[model samples]
Target: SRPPHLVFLLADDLGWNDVGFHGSRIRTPHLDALAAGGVLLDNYYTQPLATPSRSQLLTGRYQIRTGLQHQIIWPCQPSCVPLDEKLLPQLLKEAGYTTHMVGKWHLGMYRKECLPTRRGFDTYFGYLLGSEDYYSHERCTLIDALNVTRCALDFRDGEEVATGYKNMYSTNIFTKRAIALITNHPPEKPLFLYLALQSVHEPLQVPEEYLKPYDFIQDKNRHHYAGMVSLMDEAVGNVTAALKSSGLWNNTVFIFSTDNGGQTLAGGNNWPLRGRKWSLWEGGVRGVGFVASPLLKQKGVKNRELIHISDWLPTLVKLARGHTNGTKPLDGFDVWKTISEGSPSPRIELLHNIDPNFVDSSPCSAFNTSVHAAIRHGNWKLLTGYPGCGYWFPPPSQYNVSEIPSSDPPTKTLWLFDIDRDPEERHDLSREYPHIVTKLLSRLQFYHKHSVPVYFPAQDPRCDPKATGVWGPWM
Candidate 1:
């Protein structure tokens, strides 16, 4: 018999309570079903942004090691996952698994080598950018920033397939393709499908039918955002239904998670969490983590494991009966035993953020000069920079800011918290636990000393705009 099939369903910019399983009003019964059938991870963590999270998830190492620590890869930027890293797909393919990738491929697209077809996936279908309009399949910022000039957003099927479905809703198209792949694949061979859904992101767009459910939501952005999430949930339900109907449900290891915390501009809510997307706070990094398989004996239970996005590579490799040979030392742990047997997870500490720009940066640096870093050791977390407030402006007249209490104190330099007790990150225990703060800060310093420099450091003049013909080469 073939090894168990692995289905990774990745959502873009989803929030902590966005799904039904987490007490959200949004209709996510399919995701709810997944939670009911398997284990719901309560303490799961990811990077506060997309590119870093995806890099860590695929390579099973910190983005700093892969030279993608700072900023996302823009459409025309000459940056990508370094060629040296061994990805999850490559490991699984070595184990005789047929790999497929669908939806967003934000890591890189400027170069031929950076595309998914060359990155261990047997087949690839989707856009190759940070975001696009949900209906028109064009760059999101181009429409709003530049006048009607439509810059080509590469929507490829192996290599830019245009089958006249360009105007169709993105969520629907992704769902359809995913179902077809699930229903059409040969059951005799093990499969590894990476389904990255472009939903609930900015430029919130959904079909009218899906939007009708959220008409009661007074906030315009919230209503549209809710509809987008509901549509993605429906798509997930459809895919899972296909899985069950094809008899692949039981033998498959299904994992679902958001790329990062939700963006408040997209009307995302991360209530009870400290911060929104782009922060090192709990709400920014803590995602809706879910895992389902008939192989799991402990069903409908909450596992309080400190699992990082990077761990999935090794965990899936172990589940597929494969090895991580010839690969660089992985920052992620193989938490399969802990997840399956209900044993305590071995991940005691997590180095969330450490940017080199803060320590060393010239005037030519294209990246943000400011530094925002955090690290978690046992129950305590240390933040080195100011935790900024994340909320969309043009403040609504009726919106009351006073009612929403601040998550972090008005401290300038360093703040510490026992996250186990202060989940919301409201109380700062730095003054009380001075010893622990000093110890954790020292540990952070060690990581900073050994941290790898970003490959395409923002200081490169090529990152700047030049009116002349090609003056610089990538690498």
Candidate 2:
């Protein structure tokens, strides 16, 4: 039989306990059914933020290698996936698969070469910022560190601005376009559809019918957020149904995952997990992921293997029968065998976050600070620098709930945890496992050498001060 078609459904800022299968109060029947019919990736992980996660996902390499080591690509900042890197869509397209990307292309959009169409995708349709207003299609919250607002509109087609779907709900528009792509696709060639949803992100907006289902959620933000999740769930069902109706269901490998942890400030629930979106805690990096394929003999299995976001490139490339000889060395491993036959994943260690440009404070002249990083090997994880806590309960005005117990342990430059035993990260064990921390620290340092410094504009004050130097947008 021909290689199976690939359908990657990615969610934005979804929480660990926000899906129906995970006992979330939010309604997500479609995701629940998919999990019930496939393997649930209990230990999958990605970067702590969206752009970094996406860069790793598409390149099958660490974000550090791509010069996207920290934070997100700001609006029109010229930040992007490096030009030399080989993306998943480009690799799949070489194997005769039709590539399509529908929604939230935050990787890069400043120049023509940076757009999705030029990279590898045959077609691209989405907005070009980290977050956008759900209705206005304009940029979302840009409150400066000192309290100021920055805004712009950023919806686009393959290359030009998309103006037709301004008033439509983004979730519905993306879903409808996805179904249309699948329906119109020719069966002779395999399809690679990347459906990146913008639901549950900031600037929450959903229709009244969807909102009605979450009226029990007293906090207005939480209520609206739940509605957004419900709408996204329905969109998933619609796309899956489209695949079935088009006779592509049984011959496809459908993968579902969130880019990163939820944003607590935006009504995301990452309870039991220490931190949210921007932190290095499990809640920020660990994601909700699963793979459903009719081609697999097993169903409803839970795979505890360590799968990282970067692994998708090598995994999908191998499954699609594509070659990667000319590409740069990949950090991802092909876990197809492990996912299909229940074998142990070959991934032994994962470097979650690292900043190669970080400087130590001994000299304390211009650069003096501990670097940020989280590394995992076996069941133990080592976290350095800072990892903040997420707000589990509603805000002061939103609800009158008592204080939620702090999940934080005592602050330290180096902290360790046996993640398998304490996934919530409630305790620190660095003193007990000093040798292990040293060992993992060595591993992290090795990758740090291979890390490339991010290219920032010469004049952008928002750029990391630790970065070696700044370059122009065309850099």
Candidate 3:
């Protein structure tokens, strides 16, 4: 049988300035080396939060269409990515691939049926919530390698079981699990790996040696965060080495990206981009990502095509020539054809929304039912939100039943800018292009009103108080 088609690596909460390609000061040799060999999407954007990014990535739809228009799921939260909606791994599996995931399954928690294995993956070995203690490796009552109910890890290879690590530090554990899956996979089966790492999220823990190296960084939190970043960088190196050693690197398609923007307070930086993890500005929604593989060689090249997370599903299915969501249209476009065969796609518009009322727990700037929308068509992008004081976490202006009340009187004002010229989203030209702003804003409103979701109660468990309690510095 042929080898697996794709191995997707997702970093949780890594920011624009975290990767070497983006000008981070951290030592990320693996990522830097990877970027050198791949094309970097200079203007990649996800939902301004985590769950939405995950939802859009999995379903190839808008987060609003998935009921995950908010934050991370709480304990026992309802299923977000529904069984009816096809996932990338499931689609690949149907097309003759063994799907697998290694870490940080943060979509929803509680039932096994809703977990990754039940969803699409043939193998699953990671936590199902947001962030867990790296050293304690414990999120709430669940210890290492168990669900919240104290159940044993559903399935694991020798590596995971032997480690059975319950401490807070988990970067190394996730890396080992990913490596084991690659080396132990049946040589005849095509595999799909979703290696999600929890390194740069919080409670930044690292080996004593890594921590020692960053001691001179001054701020204690930054020091710990630097160590964690290093650990994640090393994990990348290990995975790349493993693939190369297995003779899988050549044909294997690799996609590396993060769940969302990083937290500036926790040693993560989003410079050159205004906001942080929670803001609606470029820093919050725009992410750093790229793809690499020999499959892209024939016509492969770095692309600046404005691709959204939802596009991943269609792209993967197209790569495998598989079917899942029928022909129903998705919010994202299939850029693989364009990137792989030098084919052109009929996509010219990109849209994003993060309503304040769209609450989940992404620690984002938009938590209530306030309207925050942006639409990009060609070089023009129009954004409208409740502009508050000079701060990323702008306070609420007013609450509408279904959306954000535009404090700019009764007029639906707009702010326009050429995205290519201002990737940082600094200058606005709404006054100069009044006609375009009016047309784009109308279109954005129309799309928001339509679009049926494909997931379940969208999310259950809702939010956990204890999960928030785990936020205190445990480094």
- Lowest lDDT 10-residue stretch of candidate 2: 360-369
Q: Count the backbone clashes (under 3 Å) in each candidate.
A: 1, 0, 26
lDDT of 3: 0.65
lDDT of 2 by residue, 102-141 (tens): 9988887666677888999999888767787777777633
Over 390-435, each residue of candidate 3 has an lDDT whose tens digit, in order, gives: 1232111111121122234444334677887886556768888878
How does model 3 score by TM-score?
0.81
Candidate that scores best on lDDT: 2
Residue 188 accuracy (lDDT) in model 2: 83
How high is the CA lDDT of each candidate model?
0.77, 0.79, 0.65
Ranking by TM-score: 2, 1, 3
Error (Å) of candidate 3 at residue 66 is 1.3
| Model 3 CA lDDT for position 456 | 36
Q: List ranges where model 1 is wrong by over 4 Å.
A: 140-150, 161-163, 356-370, 390-411, 456-475
Per-residue lDDT of model 1, residues 337-415, tens digit only: 7777789888999999776443211110111213567889889898776444532222222354412654444555577
- What is the TM-score of each predicted model, taking all chains together? 0.89, 0.90, 0.81
